[PDB]
Design a protein around this ligand. Structure first.
Ligand code: 3AT
Ligand code: MN
Ligand code: MN
Ligand code: MN
Length: 463
């Protein structure tokens, strides 16, 4: 399955079956498993959507006066990708989906006629288009479910039901907006066909994602890993132990990565050359890709490094987390510990001797939401300033922010490790205000401030 022979073909022992069942059981309480009723409800919602897509495309087809041997056979289908597709959807998160339509349907139609169709559907509320983004998307809450819809116009007269979007010939000549909108599905579909046992893969991913979250290292934006990245690490682990079940896979996961020789890239398959002029991660021909610290490459063309935002600080943090994970699973395997110990959250607010507290405020909840989103995307800047400081070894940003007239304030806690800081944090705040204003995304009285604190005096700035 992988690009290398597996490390071991051994299958589990009954001992492991029982350990795998216990793992499943310590997970339920965490809501890791979506409720079946909800899963059924999502399934029925998607079906309705898919029918709305077919309806719409059919309609466009007629207005373009195509023949009936075609109008009747023109397809149209919605494809789900990402987490919900992997079967490890994060309760509270949306459902990502790609609307695949034939040649005769333009993107303009998507944001016009299709958009107006969703507008007049009883279940549709909060309909909002963002057709000017990197990946054009139509967002909406469909019967209480949050959904993101991307559009892709393929060079086909009809969209056959069995269409497999992995086919690299489908991207040829397409507009980049169309190409980008296809990446999610292709990556997801590649992953699923790149693992020896979907089920075992699924359960392991569930565990790993929870683990990363409980350990404050789950965030693509902040330099750690996102869902897709975690999925690829688990998959590589699965390729290596093809007959193992979740129990040993979670353990192997830690053995394998706590010892990974970075920046050697994690690949799910051998990359193939494809003209297309699309950006491809490849240190052999792109000197800039040689600076990536923890490369985890997506398997679909154009292969890209899903973790180029990793810095010395985050990688270091994650390496240490992997080692502790290995240690815990070791004793879980010896029965000297229970699975609950893996998902136990270390007091982030107590593992470092020094911290930086980041405060973001706004005059209204709407703005606090926007503002916080902006500042979050700026935090890596500070982490960068900190690393370039002789006195600092690493900065660990706890990715889970939390609540601090009618105050509307949020705050982050950053862990520091030393080998005073006022200039760097002051520098950071000025940059945040400056960029946010230069990019016309600043509102009066939106505030951001940071203060260095010693572990001992963090208490007074928390609940
Ligand atoms: N509106 C969007 N525009 C562009 N890319 C999107 C959009 N929504 C999701 N994606 C991309 O699709 C990929 C898979 O989605 P999703 O499953 O939500 O990712 P994660 O991998 O972000 O999942 P978790 O929710 O963290 O479990 C990764 C994500 O960046
Ligand atoms: Mn999502
Ligand atoms: Mn989304
Ligand atoms: Mn997500």
């Amino acid at each position: 399955y992988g690009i290398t022979s597996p490390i071991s073909l051994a299958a589990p022992k009954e001992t492991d079956c029982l350990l795998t069942q216990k793992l499943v059981e310590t997970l339920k309480p965490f809501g890791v498993f979506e409720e079946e009723e909800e899963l059924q409800r999502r399934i029925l919602i998607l079906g309705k959507l898919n029918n709305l897509v077919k309806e719409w495309i059919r309609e466009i087809s007629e207005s373009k006066n195509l023949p009936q041997s075609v109008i009747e056979n023109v397809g149209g289908k919605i494809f789900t990708f990402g987490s919900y597709r992997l079967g490890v959807h994060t309760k509270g998160a949306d459902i990502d989906a790609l609307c695949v339509a034939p040649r005769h349907v333009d993107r303009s139609d998507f944001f016009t006629s299709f958009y107006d169709k969703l507008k007049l559907q009883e279940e549709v509320k909060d309909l909002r288009a963002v057709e000017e983004a990197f990946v054009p998307v139509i967002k909406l809450c469909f019967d209480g479910i949050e959904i993101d819809i991307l559009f892709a116009r393929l060079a086909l007269q009809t969209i056959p039901e069995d269409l497999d979007l992995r086919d690299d010939s489908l991207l040829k000549n397409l507009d980049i907006r169309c190409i980008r909108s296809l990446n999610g599905c292709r990556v997801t579909d590649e992953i699923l066909h790149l693992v020896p046992n979907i089920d075992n893969f699924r359960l392991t991913l569930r565990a790993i994602k929870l683990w990363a979250k409980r350990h404050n290292i789950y965030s693509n934006i902040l330099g750690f890993l996102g869902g897709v990245s975690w999925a690829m690490l688990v998959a590589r682990t699965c390729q290596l132990y093809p007959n193992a079940i979740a129990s040993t896979l979670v353990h192997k996961f830690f053995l394998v990565f706590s010892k990974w020789e970075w920046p050697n890239p994690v690949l799910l398959k051998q990359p193939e050359e494809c003209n297309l002029n699309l950006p491809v991660w490849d240190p052999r021909v792109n000197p800039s890709d040689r600076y990536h610290l923890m490369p985890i490459i997506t398997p679909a063309y154009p292969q890209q490094n899903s973790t180029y935002n990793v810095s010395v600080s985050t990688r270091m943090v994650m390496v240490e987390e992997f080692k502790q994970g290995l240690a815990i699973t070791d004793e879980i395997l010896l029965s000297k510990a229970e699975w609950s110990k893996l998902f136990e959250a270390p007091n982030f607010f107590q593992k470092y001797k020094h911290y930086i507290v980041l405060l973001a405020s706004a005059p209204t909840e709407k703005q606090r939401l926007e503002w916080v989103g902006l500042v979050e995307s700026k935090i890596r800047i500070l982490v960068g300033s900190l690393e370039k400081n002789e006195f600092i070894t690493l900065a660990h940003v706890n990715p889970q922010s939390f609540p601090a007239k009618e105050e509307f304030r949020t705050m982050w806690v950053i862990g520091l490790v030393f080998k005073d800081l006022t200039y760097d944090i002051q520098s950071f705040t000025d940059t945040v205000y400056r960029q946010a204003i230069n990019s016309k995304m600043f509102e009066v009285d939106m505030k951001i401030a940071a203060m260095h604190v010693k572990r001992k005096q963090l208490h007074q700035l928390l609940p």
